[PDB]
Structures are given as C-alpha cells and as structure tokens.
Design an enzyme around this catalytic site. Structure first.
Site, PDB file in Angstrom:
ATOM      1  N   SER C 201       0.828  -1.206   0.000  1.00  0.00           N
ATOM      2  CA  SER C 201       0.000   0.000   0.000  1.00  0.00           C
ATOM      3  C   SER C 201       0.871   1.268   0.000  1.00  0.00           C
ATOM      4  O   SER C 201       1.685   1.464  -0.905  1.00  0.00           O
ATOM      5  CB  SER C 201      -0.937  -0.013   1.215  1.00  0.00           C
ATOM      6  OG  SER C 201      -2.029   0.878   1.039  1.00  0.00           O
ATOM      7  N   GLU C 334      -8.786  -5.329  -4.606  1.00  0.00           N
ATOM      8  CA  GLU C 334      -8.150  -4.297  -3.799  1.00  0.00           C
ATOM      9  C   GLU C 334      -9.105  -3.435  -2.992  1.00  0.00           C
ATOM     10  O   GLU C 334      -8.762  -2.945  -1.915  1.00  0.00           O
ATOM     11  CB  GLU C 334      -7.292  -3.403  -4.691  1.00  0.00           C
ATOM     12  CG  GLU C 334      -6.093  -4.115  -5.294  1.00  0.00           C
ATOM     13  CD  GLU C 334      -5.010  -4.464  -4.267  1.00  0.00           C
ATOM     14  OE1 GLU C 334      -5.254  -4.348  -3.041  1.00  0.00           O
ATOM     15  OE2 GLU C 334      -3.904  -4.863  -4.699  1.00  0.00           O
ATOM     16  N   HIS C 447      -7.428  -6.154  -0.084  1.00  0.00           N
ATOM     17  CA  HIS C 447      -6.244  -5.335   0.160  1.00  0.00           C
ATOM     18  C   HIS C 447      -5.453  -5.865   1.365  1.00  0.00           C
ATOM     19  O   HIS C 447      -5.996  -6.027   2.463  1.00  0.00           O
ATOM     20  CB  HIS C 447      -6.686  -3.887   0.415  1.00  0.00           C
ATOM     21  CG  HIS C 447      -5.572  -2.886   0.387  1.00  0.00           C
ATOM     22  ND1 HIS C 447      -4.785  -2.679  -0.726  1.00  0.00           N
ATOM     23  CD2 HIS C 447      -5.147  -2.000   1.320  1.00  0.00           C
ATOM     24  CE1 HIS C 447      -3.926  -1.708  -0.477  1.00  0.00           C
ATOM     25  NE2 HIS C 447      -4.126  -1.278   0.757  1.00  0.00           N
TER      26      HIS C 447
END
Ligand SMILES: CC(=O)N[C@H]1[C@H]([C@H](O)[C@H](O)CO)O[C@@](O)(C(=O)O)C[C@@H]1O
Ligand SMILES: CC(=O)N[C@H]1[C@H]([C@H](O)[C@H](O)CO)O[C@@](O)(C(=O)O)C[C@@H]1O
Ligand SMILES: CC(=O)N[C@H]1[C@H]([C@H](O)[C@H](O)CO)O[C@@](O)(C(=O)O)C[C@@H]1O
Ligand SMILES: *[C@@H]1O[C@H](CO)[C@@H](O)[C@H](O)[C@H]1NC(C)=O
Ligand SMILES: *[C@@H]1O[C@H](CO)[C@@H](O)[C@H](O)[C@H]1NC(C)=O
Ligand SMILES: *[C@@H]1O[C@H](CO)[C@@H](O)[C@H](O)[C@H]1NC(C)=O
Lengths: 532, 532, 532
Positions: C201, C334, C447
C-alpha cells in the site's frame, strides 16, 4: 589607584581592589566571570559550551547568581558556611556558570602563584561560590583563590541513563571551569602549572570524582577532599537511574513514553516549574514513613561513560591512570549537628535506645545504604557499648558519620596510597566560635567546621580568640604549602606524616599532632558487614 | 510577452513587467525577494543568516510584509511618503527581511547599470520598502533601484549592552542586504561594482552609519544621506543601554536577573506580545510630564564593537579607513510639520513665547539633548530675534531642525571632506503638491519633501505641474549621475559645486543655484553651546 | 544462551534470541534500534539527522513507539495486518524513527545474507513496523528482515510548497533508514550489497517513489511494490499544496502570514495539539457532503525538488537513471472490503444502481480523481454489464480498485520494463483464514491479503490449513529468491515469467500459474477516459 583590568581570552575584565588588615599589596577581586555559555533553553541537560567573547570591558564587580536550588535551604547553608561577616544574599538563575577570582598578585608584573580552585558542597542540590570569600587565604598564603559554580540538582544531574541525557552536567561544568583556569589564570598572576582543586562535602566528592575522571586529567596537580569522597554512597547513583528520571518527569508533569521524550518535555519547562518539581521531590530532608529503599535523597553523580567509565570502586582498583598528591580528611563529628539538623532527624529527645536506633538506621537507608538484615549487628556494634540512652544517641551519630565519611575517606586514601601517589589524611577536631547558636556546645568537629580555618574566617569575622586565629593560620599554611609542593609540611608547622603504610595522619585542632591508623578499626568492621 | 525569470544564487525568481509612460523597454519588477533567513524564534536578536535556497521558480510578485511596528503609525508614514498614487496597505510580520528590485535593463542581454539601494527611514521604529516605488527613477535614469527592509524597533535594536545581545540587528540586516546585491544584482542588469546606497531620515542615518562601519566596507561605492546622519543624536544611543534593556524586559513581563535571562525571556515572547510592549513604551510620541532626561525616544544604533567600534564622533576623527563619494543634504524646514505632527507636539496655538519655548525645548531633551542650563541661551539666540509670538514658534522649529539635522549634517560633510573624500551638500527648498492637506501651505521644504522629486512622484501621481515635473527630472538626474560617476554634475544641469573648502553647496528648488557655507553660522553657535 | 550483542557504528546493541518451530539456529531479534536523531522540537519538519552515539550497551528489547497518528485507526490497522498471534499494543510518540531487525544468521560467524527492508503501509497517516513480525520470513528463507518506521501525517508530510518546508519528511526517513542499513547491516549477518526494499500500500508507493528518487540511489538493489505504486494518485499531491498547508495551519490555530510563519507556529505546537488537528482534519474517512474536489484525503508525497525532481509520470518517461529488478503486484479485489470499511463507504445496502454509483464515483474524487464529466462513461463501462444491483456494487468496487491499483501498477511495470530493467508482476487471489470476521466470505484477494503469506502468518498464528501453509512457503520462497537474484524463480516453484513484451505475470493463489497481459484491457480504457 585604578580598578584592576585583566585581559582574558574572551575579553577584558574589570575588578576591584580590596586590602586586608596588615597587608600592603591589595588583593584584586573579580566577581562573576563567565566560564561557559549560559545553559539556557536547549542547552539545558547538555555539556557546558565555551562562553561568547565580549567586545569591551566586562564588569566583574557583582556577585553572580547561585544556580537554581531550594531558596530557603540554599540561603541557610550559605549563612552557616560563610566565612565573611555579613552573609551576602544571592539570586537564583539557570544562568549561573560563573567563577570568582581572588588574586594577591601584583598584576602590573608577571606572577605565577599557585592556584587553588574551590568547589562548594551542598549535596549537589544547593550551594554557591559567593558563600566563600577568598580574601584572607589569598592574602595570607599568597595564592590565587578561585571559587567556581556548577549546575545543581535537576539542572546539573538529571539522567535518563542513556545517550539522551547521560547526566553529570554539574561535574562537566567543574571540568569546564578548570579548563578556563588553564587558559586564563596566567592573566591573574596564577600558575596554570600548579592548580590545586579542593572542595568540601559534595565538593569533596566532586574533587574525588575529578581525580578518577579521564576528562579532568591535566587540569589540576593536587587535590584536597574535605569530608567527602567518591565512595560516599548517597552522592553516587549506582544501578538503573531510569526510574528516578521517570519519577522526576512525572512530578514535572511530563510523559515518559521514551527517554528522548522526557528530556524534550523537561527542556520546555520553565526554570520555576523545575524548581517547584525540586521542592515536590523533597530532596535534602529525610523520609520518615514509607519504604526507605525507595526514598531518593538526591540526584547525584552517575556512571555516564564520559566523565566516569565505571564505578568509583572499580576505577580506583586500577593504577593505569595519572595520579597526583591527594589530601583526604574528615571532621571529628561529621554527623554531629549540621547535617542531621538540615535533614530534620527525629533526634529531638536527645536520647535513643537500641530499638529506636535500628528503626532510624533503617529509615536512614538512602544515606548509609545498610541492609535491614545488617541493622541489628551494626547498631549492636556501636550502641551496645553502654546503657546510657544519651550515649547511644551520640554513638548512633558516629555510626552514620563513619559510614558516610569515616570509612569511605580512609578507603579512598589507602587506595590512592597503594596506587603509588602521595597521600595525606587529617581529622579536624575543633568547634569554631562561628558555629550556629542552635548548635550544642558539646558538638566539636561538626560537618564543615574546618571551613572557618581553611578560609581564614578569624580574619573576616569578629570574636576569634588568639587560639582560633592561630589555628586558621596553621591550616591555611598547610593547605597553601600543599598547593605549592604537594606536601603540607613547612617550617614553623607541626610535622604532618605522609599517609604511607604506617597510615600516619594529622589531628588538627587545639593540639595538632600526628597519629596513626585513622578509623582503621571501623573500616575493618564495615568492610565485613557490607561483605554481607 | 513572458514574465521575467531571473536566476539568483539561491534559486530562480519570477517577476512582472511594467511599462512607464514614454518608455519602450518595460521595467522588470521583483517584489519580496528574500535576502536572509526569517529571523524567527531563536534567530531573534541575532545577526541575519543566509537564506535557504529554493527548488523551483519563486514568485516575487507580491509585496512583502513590513517588519513588526506600530501598525497605525507605520501606515500613516507610508501614506505620507509613498510616491505612488494609491498607497499599498501592508501586513506586519517578523518575517520581513526582503528587498524589492526595479530594473530597467533588458534582461535578455548583459547589462551592468549602476545600482541604487534605498534605505527607508522611520526613526528605526516604523517604515517599509514597499512604500517606495522605484519604477520612475529606474526607467528615467536607467539605473537598478533596490528598496530593502531591515528589522525595526525591539526586533532590530534591542541591546543588553553585552555579548548576549549587542544590538544593531537592523543595521546588520542592511549589511546583509548589500552582500546579497553583490552576489546577485548582476543577474538583474546591475553592476555590483557601482552600488550606491541612499536613505532618508533614519535611512539617512543608516547610510551614514554604514559609511563608518568596517563591515559594510566594499559593499557600496557612493552614499547619499537625506535629512539624517550618524550625528543625529536621537538615533545613536551613547552610554549604558542596560537600563533601557531592563525597562523593556520588565514592560514585556520578563525577569532581569541577568542579560542572558532577559534575551532568553524576550525570545520566548510572541510577536504580538512584543508589539504590545512597543506600544506601551510609546516610542514615537513626545513625553509631556515627568523628567525629560528619562524619556526614551527609541531604540537606536549603539556602539556594539562589531558594526561600530566607537562613537560616530570618534570614528570620523580618523581617516585610516576606506572612503567613497558622499552626498549629504537637508530640507529647508526639517521640523516644519511632519515630525512635530507625528510626535504630537503642543504647538496647537500656532504661537509661542520665550518661557514656553524654554519649557518645550526642555521636554524635547530626548530629541535635541540640550542641557537645561543651556536652554536659556539657546532659546534667546533663536527666538530673541523678534517679539512676534508666531515668529517665535517658527524660529523654535528652526532651533530644533538645526540641532537634529542642520548642524549634524554639515559637520559630517566637513569631516568627510577633510578626510579627503568627494563630498557634496544640498538644501532642498520646495513644497510638493503631494503634501498632506493638514500641512500648512506656508511650510516649504518639510521633512521628506525631497522624496517626491527623488522617486519621481510627478510621474506616478497626478496633478504635478510642469514645474514640479521638471524639478523631479533634475533631481533624479543629479542622483543617478552621482550614482554613476560619484559626481552629480552632468550636461543640462545646474553646476553643483563640490563641498570643498569654499563649502559650496546646491540649493534645489524652484530656482536651483549654487551657494556657500550652509548653516556655517549655526554650526559655530552650537559647537560652543554644546562645548558647555 | 547469552543474549545477542551486536556492535553498530553508534554503539553496542543487545537483542534477544527466539527459536522458530523446526529451526535449530535461533533468530536474533533487535527491537527499536534508533536510525536517526529524534525529530523533536525544531527538528520537526526537517530532514532526519544522524543518531547520537551511545556509551554502553543499548537494550533493543522493547517495541518502539509508532509515530503519532490516529490511535484508534492505527491500532485497528495493526490488528488487521499483523501476522503474529497476539497483536502488540503500541504507544504514540514523535520519537519514532526506529527499526527492528530479525536476523537468522549465526552472529558468531561472518554472514552476508540478503537483506529485506520492509516499509509498512497505512496511507502515510498510520502504521507501525512492530505490526510486522519478521521471525518466520527470516528463519524460513534465511534472509535478514528489517522493518522500518518513518514520520506519518503532518509530522512526515507537511509541506508549504517552498523551501521553508518542502515536505516528504517521511520518505527522507525511509532513505535515512536505508543508509543506516548500508553502514550497519553487516554487523547483523546482512549483506549491504544485496538490499531489497518491499512494502505494501502506502509502503508500496514509498518503494515506488524511492525507485524514482536520486537520493535513494545505491541504497537498495531490488524493489517490491505490493498494492501501491507512484502512480496511485491519492498518495502523490500534484499542484499547489499551499492551500492544504494553510488549511492545516488554521485548523491548528496558526496564522498564515507567510510560509516561514506557518512552519514556525506549527513547530511550537505540542504533539498532542497536532494530533488533535489531525483528527479534526478527518483524513482516512470519506467526505459525503460538500464538494469532492475540495475533500483532502491525506498529506501525501509532493514534488519537493529534493526527493523527486518532477512528477512520477514525468520521471518514469526517462531512462537516464539507474534501474534495478522491480516486482509490482496487486490483489484480486483491492477495494473488496478493508479499504471501503476503514473509509466508511455508504455501501451498507450491499447493492447499488447506475445513478447512486455515479453519485459515489463523484464523491470518491479524492481517491480516483475522475472528472464529473467522465463519471457517466466510466460507470457505464463497468456497471452497465448487468441489471443485478448487487453485481453493480461489486463491479463498482472493481472500478475503484482498478483506478487506484490495477491500472497504475501495470503502467509502472510497463514503463520499468521498457526502461530496460528486470520487471515482474503478480496478482494475488486468495482469502486468508486470518481475515476479519466482519469481512464477507465472498471477498477474495482483498487489500493486504498477501501480507499473511509474505510474512508467514501460517507459522505464527493458528488454524492455517495445509493449503495456506504451503502457499505462504511458496510466496516467501519467491520473495526471498527475488531478494537473492533479482529473479523470483527457483527449483520446486511454479515458473514465474518475466514481465517482458508478452506481459506474462504470475497468478498466486490456491492454483498458482502464469498468465498474460494483466489488466491490459482496463489500462486501455482508462488511458483514454483520462485523456479526456
Ligand atoms: C503572502 C505573501 O505576500 N507571500 C507570498 C510569497 C512571496 O514570495 C514573499 O512573501 C515575498 O514576496 O510567495 C508567493 O508570492 C509565491 O511564491 O507565489 C505567494 C505568497 O503569498
Ligand atoms: C550579565 C549580567 O546581567 N550580570 C550582571 C553582571 C555580573 O558581574 C555578572 O555576573 C558578570 O558580569 O554585572 C553587571 O553590572 C555588569 O556590568 O557586568 C551587569 C549585571 O548586573
Ligand atoms: C522507557 C521505555 O519503555 N523505553 C525503552 C527504550 C527502547 O529502546 C525504545 O523505547 C525503543 O524501543 O530503551 C530500552 O530499550 C533500553 O535501551 O534499555 C528500554 C526502555 O524501557
Ligand atoms: C563598571 O564600572 C565602571 C567604574 O568602575 C562604571 O563606570 C560602569 O558603569 C560599570 N558598569 C556597570 C553599569 O555595571
Ligand atoms: C505565482 O506562482 C504561481 C504558482 O507558484 C503561478 O501559478 C503563477 O505564475 C503566479 N501567480 C501570481 C501572479 O502570483
Ligand atoms: C537490558 O538487559 C540487561 C540484561 O541483558 C538488564 O541488566 C538491563 O536492566 C536491561 N535494561 C537496562 C536498564 O539496561
């Protein structure tokens, strides 16, 4: 004449002339000469830095501020120790890294008189240089007297135990002052090659420490410790100092997340906020209720890894370091009145019994560090002598006096002697006419009583008998002779044996004569008791 | 076509093009170019430091803030002196070390035009560079005009008298600006080898100071002082400045234990707190009741030992220093209106008598520094001329005007001449049509009245008569010619005699012609009166 | 069994030994090793500085504090991402520039194992290194795992847009940490010549940024970006950041006179005050009402001219810079759950229609930066597939997911490839058994779901099926192999095609096999829509 103007490295200094009774050459006195940049703001809790140079002539004619400390206690100690007639009221400030110079030399010519740098005591929590007037000693023994100041309490000894605040700032200031003497004393008739450091109590412990520190090497050539050495527990913090740091941090209303955080927070506090914290901590008084093993007496010397690389015990075991003539002494009754009075001891009855003694000896932990299991044996060894309750009181005071100064001092001397350096010891037994009225007439040789002889109080204050005057002359002579040759002896003075294997020492007082094996019997007892 | 982008040492700068009526080549104007690091926080009361370099193109298109000062007074003075039609309202900030550049050169080519750096006045308490618009002077005389700013009041002149705060920060900023010009002005079509400094009032005094200072040596090659020199008492503090430092510290709510403590405490105050202190001190207004010898006019220039090694008087007595062409001038009526009005003088009656005059001349002490014993003789020498009370008023105003500017200016010029450097003097006698309505029509050549000619106000503001326009053209010509060759003269201009032994000077006004021995008679009188 | 003691440049560090199930050689773990001087006080909003050396042995045995951030959100993310069984509660502090080292090497011998430096994610607002336990990875793949920390939110990304506060402090800390590794990792059995940087991230974007920055050149030799690159808009602020700076300044109760003033003011604020400002700004949650083009998601990376000389887009267009093997990857969904959940998305209905979608896609502006004019076409292209409202929801989530990670990642990989450097891509499609209970069982490849395989959660947490355990082993193998040779492949592992012209990539999951042209169809669509 015209005021004395000496040119130092950082700029010109203007002092004043003062003549002492019966001395032609007036003494040049300079008050408040900065030897370091004011440790204000971010400089707090960091080593002292070189002073900024000044552009014209700086007036060293006003007494400097004494470092922030408990105003009441600090003043009280100044009145009790001052050798001048009128006690000079002082001001508190973080801006206190100054030094006073008293030079008897005729500055109009080149002189290199021996230099005597004085380090005041006060448990590293209170004290000031202005308390001590060097006019008599300078004039009488023809030496340059230098009284220095160093950060006290939190300001000079706060330590997180790590790199964020190693600690020992106060000591670093003493080292900083000594370097200043090295680079400037010549301009005042002083000889940088013959600098003698001497202090009393916390100041004696400071001299003791400087003698063991590598940083201070080559900044002095003789040392005198009066009632205090580096083995005086209460002043040297061994172990994890982190808890104390956190306790102070909290008391000041600071987070303790990390060391870096604590120091940062404390650096934001105002001098006054830190002073209030100091008073909340209650550092010079004895704690009655609670757990003695938790009562923190003060913020002392620590093993920072810069000034001291290991404990004083460990350091003095080695002889791989530079050594100089060392004089170590104590007074007959170190815990006679002064200290007990200042710490508010429960001895208001004038008498004590076996059980109460053990009870006090326990609560006195932060001072004597005696295990609770040893208490019985120790008290028995001293008070078991008689049944007289009043005698047990005085014997109890000897108990403490020996653990804090007697034994520590003698062990230090012995180790210095065995290391191969010239050692000298003394035991001051006299009661100055300048004692407090509140001090019992029976107490002779109380803590700091030799200060009046060393600093020639009989020649500044009134009422000194011809006996006391004579005593002061003798002491100053011995001290100055030591400062000169690293040997106290001199013509017209009682022989002072060197503290060699015979362990001869000088007993100073109404009748001054050599003796041997000072506190030899006690050192033996305590070396075993403490060996558990 | 495309905004002007100059590359300075610290980074690229983007300005704006502005065409003046009757000039093809538009002038490149850059506003608020930083020449130092913002003197914020700990940098307060310390020499100006180099500016941090920027990464891309910095927009020098907005007027910078004017240093913290009395907002009301500062604005008023800006309105009264501005040469632009509309007065630009400014903001106050401690972040004010900027300069404005007006270059007529075509940046697309290499140019080395003479550079004129302007130092605004305002008693070193108020003022701003943005007040002055260099567009007209730059285009008309083809020279690079640079208007700089420097710390005012407390911020730029607070002095403890020692190394903890020498003072003269403001002046150091001026020197810092000149260094910036040396390393950068060439990127703007300027010739760093031909830099002329010129200022009015407090700025005229600054130019005079810079001429005497070793620090500013080689940062300029010609200097012009308009209505103000280093002998203008009120701005140059002689004696112990310590008391003023303490009085300021206390008014800001600070301790005064030591100089280091005061500077530390004042460094903690917010800009607003210090602005409030400034207003409490009442520095631009005259004190009516109390003791005149105590009324502190302002925080002026001091003898720090860095910028000035000794007093202006003492400094100009020697010729062992580097010299440059110097132009010194004054206006017909320096104390005509503007000053008395800003200081709130008791002259609301329009007439004064012998007694009241001596009374005022006394309370004017912080301005004229005349002993109370001399007052009688002085007032007699000026007002004793007639019995007309109104004539006594005006003669009183000349009294002051001569002590503050007339005599000081002429002595400075003479000393400079005698030192062997090219000297020039002038007396501006003209009443700009841009004068305040509240200003009596009889006052001609008031304080700052030449500013409208020098900065070509007739070409930015409206209503200038062909006589006023023509006068401005002539003045800018003289000023630029001087900036060019160190000699005002040039074809198409009245001959301006050099201020040599004949003491010839130029009287500028509706009828410009040479004359001799300006204020020669008054200098003589005052030289004796002050010789007590 | 003696705790591990490594000697670093700044001093000795004491860690602890920990054995993993099935590994003889215990792993030496050091927690909280300072790699920079605490950014407290004036150091705030300035580059990280070298850490002060320590005198003895520093205990790196306690988890360091996590940089100041939203305590609630930070903790939640730590619980959600942690690979250890028990989540470790952390403390907030400005003093957070620390790093943790997990070395499997036998310190008693010289080892040069490959080093993997982990950069935690958290939108540059929250996160901590302690969240990630490198024990499993270190032991299983025999590599030295280093988890670093960097300044977050205001502390690490505040930018005035000029030289007074360029910004990107957090990134500079990352570069500062890498230099520390270069000068010290060898002492831990690490090979400074084989340093691989990898993050997820915001940490993935950090790695991406470091690959483009000239400052990080030669501080690493391989890079892995998991779910995040330098083309992930929301984290890289392009344009005039001045407004955001002013908005923050005001929210913290600060004037905005000038940039220097803002930075000065904010430097005075206490950590707590800035934290409160952070919460008021509401940076991780989505703004429902108001104008989407004004809603500021966070303080991200900026073009300071130091770390990044131009935009990421502009920077990757050139190949005149040093390149290294780069692995870029993304997860199947995601925007599946985690992110929408943390930002509080209005998707509580489980279904969405064409109109509401366009409504949300608009307010999602600060995340996807899609023009309101394009909204129609975009929503149509994704949700126009079916009429099923629940399918539109999930398709909407793919819309966002592709704009923030899918397309960005693939563009970055292609450019890197075309630049001539070894490139690899992967798409993680697996639902870890360690997923939050509140996470729908249908969401697979959410994610941060690869974090559990990469950090061997199956070997620290309980319940991992033999399928999950095997997956983790494979992943760590690929990762470590890459860290070793810049190529993930190795015997006993599915073939991972290099991302060359065929655009082959590896699909990691229950069934791991190569594929081609990842998101090739979407990249196409978005490249035009954004081309307006
Ligand atoms: C408020 C103000 O005037 N400051 C301005 C500064 C100036 O450069 C300096 O203040 C000196 O002019 O920078 C700007 O002009 C700019 O780069 O776009 C914008 C900013 O508003
Ligand atoms: C600096 C300071 O503020 N301290 C005091 C000094 C003391 O002597 C200092 O301890 C060392 O100068 O004395 C002064 O009168 C002086 O003229 O220097 C000023 C002030 O009262
Ligand atoms: C008070 C506290 O909790 N901090 C700890 C710090 C940590 O190094 C830092 O917090 C970074 O982890 O210092 C120690 O590790 C240490 O050197 O003995 C122990 C100490 O307890
Ligand atoms: C310093 O002393 C001189 C005279 O000895 C005196 O003139 C001067 O004012 C003194 N400085 C101050 C103000 O402390
Ligand atoms: C100043 O700079 C900004 C951005 O730095 C730019 O958009 C423009 O050219 C300038 N705007 C003005 C006139 O201030
Ligand atoms: C560090 O660990 C040692 C044992 O390895 C311990 O003695 C010490 O107390 C710990 N922390 C400190 C305070 O140094």
């Amino acid at each position: 004449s015209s005021p004395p103007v000496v040119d130092t490295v950082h700029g010109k200094v203007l002092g004043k002339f003062v003549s002492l009774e019966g001395f032609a050459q007036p003494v040049a006195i300079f008050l408040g000469i900065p030897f370091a940049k004011p440790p204000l703001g971010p400089l707090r809790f960091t080593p002292p830095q070189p002073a900024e140079p000044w552009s014209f002539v700086k007036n060293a004619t006003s007494y400097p501020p004494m470092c922030t400390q408990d105003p009441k206690a600090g003043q009280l100690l100044s009145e009790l120790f001052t050798n001048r007639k009128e006690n000079i009221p002082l001001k508190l400030s973080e801006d206190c890294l100054y030094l006073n110079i008293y030079t008897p030399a005729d500055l109009t010519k080149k002189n290199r008189l021996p230099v005597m740098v004085w380090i005041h005591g006060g448990g590293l929590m209170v004290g000031a240089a202005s308390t001590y007037d060097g006019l008599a000693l300078a004039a009488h023994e023809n030496v340059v007297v230098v009284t220095i100041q160093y950060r006290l309490g939190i300001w000079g000894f706060f330590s997180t135990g790590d790199e964020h605040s190693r600690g020992n700032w106060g000591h670093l200031d003493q080292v900083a002052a000594l370097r200043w003497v090295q680079d400037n004393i010549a301009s005042f008739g002083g000889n940088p090659g013959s600098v003698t450091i001497f202090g009393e109590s916390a100041g004696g412990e400071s001299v003791s420490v400087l003698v063991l520190s590598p940083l201070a090497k080559n900044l002095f050539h003789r040392a005198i410790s009066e009632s205090g050495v580096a083995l005086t527990s209460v002043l040297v913090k061994k172990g994890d100092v982190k808890p104390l740091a956190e306790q102070i941090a909290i008391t000041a209303g600071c987070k303790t997340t990390t060391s870096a955080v604590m120091v940062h927070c404390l650096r934001q506090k105002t001098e006054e906020e830190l002073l209030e914290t100091t008073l909340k901590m209650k550092f010079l008084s004895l704690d009655l209720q609670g757990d003695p093993r938790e009562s923190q007496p003060l913020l002392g010397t620590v093993i920072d890894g810069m000034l001291l690389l290991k404990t004083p015990e460990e350091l003095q075991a080695e002889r791989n370091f530079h050594t100089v003539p060392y004089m170590v002494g104590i007074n007959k009754q170190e815990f006679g009145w002064l200290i007990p009075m200042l710490m508010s001891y429960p001895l208001s009855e004038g008498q004590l019994d076996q059980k109460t003694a053990m009870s006090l000896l326990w609560k006195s932990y932060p001072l004597v560090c005696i295990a609770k299991e040893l208490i019985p044996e120790a008290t028995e060894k001293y008070l078991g002598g008689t049944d007289d309750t009043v005698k047990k009181k005085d014997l109890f005071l000897d108990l403490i006096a020996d653990v804090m100064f007697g034994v520590p001092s003698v062990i230090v001397a012995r180790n210095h002697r065995d290391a191969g350096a010239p050692t000298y010891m003394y035991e001051f037994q006299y009661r100055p006419s300048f004692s407090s009225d509140m001090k019992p007439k029976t107490v002779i040789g109380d803590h700091g009583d030799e200060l009046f002889s060393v600093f020639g109080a009989p020649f500044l204050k009134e009422g000194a008998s011809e006996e006391e005057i004579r005593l002061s002359k003798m002491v100053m002579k011995f001290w100055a002779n030591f400062a000169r040759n690293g040997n106290p002896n001199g013509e017209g003075l009682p022989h002072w044996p060197e503290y060699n294997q015979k362990e001869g020492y000088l007993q100073i007082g109404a009748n001054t004569q050599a003796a041997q094996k000072l506190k030899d019997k006690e050192v033996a007892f305590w070396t075993n008791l403490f060996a558990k």
